[PDB]
Assembly symmetry: C4
Homo-oligomer: 32 residues x 4
């Protein structure tokens, strides 16, 4: 009930990791 | 709060898709670019 | 108690808006 | 959960500072770049 807030939280974390992979690709296309 | 927490969770998710999609566009622009 | 989870949530939203301003600057430096 | 929710909130924040800082570095690289 709460348990559901946590689920949301997990889901959030997961988009942030996907954002990190995007930036890893962008960084290389530039030349970091 | 609660009705409230899940209103903020949605704005957050919704913001997160907007960010992923701006990043996807930039990545595709380089490529090239 | 919960009330504190909301506070966190607000804080999260706020970094996402700051990320959006960063990307607005990056987009212009490129030429979107 | 709770002990738990605020463990996930922290990882999330911590991830969010990492993202802001990668973006800041990219922005500074262009500039230029």
């Amino acid at each position: 009930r709460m348990k559901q807030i946590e689920d949301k939280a997990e889901e959030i974390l997961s988009k942030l990791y996907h954002i990190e992979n995007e930036l890893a690709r962008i960084k290389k296309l530039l030349g970091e």
